[PDB]
Predict the structure of echovirus 1.
Amino acid sequence: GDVQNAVEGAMVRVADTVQTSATNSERVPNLTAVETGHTSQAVPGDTMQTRHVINNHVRSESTIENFLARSACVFYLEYKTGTKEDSNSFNNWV
Amino acid sequence: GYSDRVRSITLGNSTITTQECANVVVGYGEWPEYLSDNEATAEDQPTQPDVATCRFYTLDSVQWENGSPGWWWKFPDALRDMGLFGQNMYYHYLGRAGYTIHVQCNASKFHQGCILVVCVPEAEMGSAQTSGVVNYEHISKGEIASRFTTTTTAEDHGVQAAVWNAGMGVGVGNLTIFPHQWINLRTNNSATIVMPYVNSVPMDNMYRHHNFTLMIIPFVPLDFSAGASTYVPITVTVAPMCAEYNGLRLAGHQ
């Protein structure tokens, strides 16, 4: 993708809820080991019987760009109208 | 065959008959149906009790009198005690349903009088004491008719039920914009409004939100003459339609 070519996106929506039925089995999606360093990729349908929901939500404003690309104040500086003699007639910021 | 005055409505283990109806109003043109996979948000499987919930519940009927100003009921709250609908509404955070509302009122060729029967969505009522706030017990007696007042005043946090402003700061003669019928004793003995789920959000809590209010207001006063049957009641029977519930936990109020 090219972060400088602004007018060139990628629409990625959120994940849908797939319908789950009742179960009685040897597979255990919610029993795991935190020690691994892994995060559980469980979905509610592994624990409950869910309906079918279509999530057209998009993770728009949480994009690094939308998050950082809002103009913030970083510093303000002060200076008077004066002569060479007046130290305060100009100013600087590192 | 088939006189259009005669009607038979069956829902669950319930049939209502009428031999003097004036068609039936389907609220805003839409027949009730279940929440679809596109419009859904609560991810859990809904319970849909069908016939056990979706049946005809007759609420406490009121008496129509010559000077009686009017009545209102609030839904789904009026049904909070009606059988398994009430239970489902009690054990679930979210509920959704449409309703077949059937108001009954019979009198005689010699009696006269005319009532507006209307289903008002989001009928948010004003406090009588404009300075203060209203409260639940003066907003709804569940299945018992809350009355409209001819009198412009009421007890602490009572609604301003003065009939000509319909309890909500508007002209009662304009209530007709909402799904409505009229029981004019000359013409008919019943009214039937099939109300869809009208709300800004797919499901809602059954207690917190009174999704709509049933108002029965007499525009032409009940009258009859010399010894011709005084008692003439108005009975409201209502059936939930396409009822489904999400978010199950313990018995609920707080």
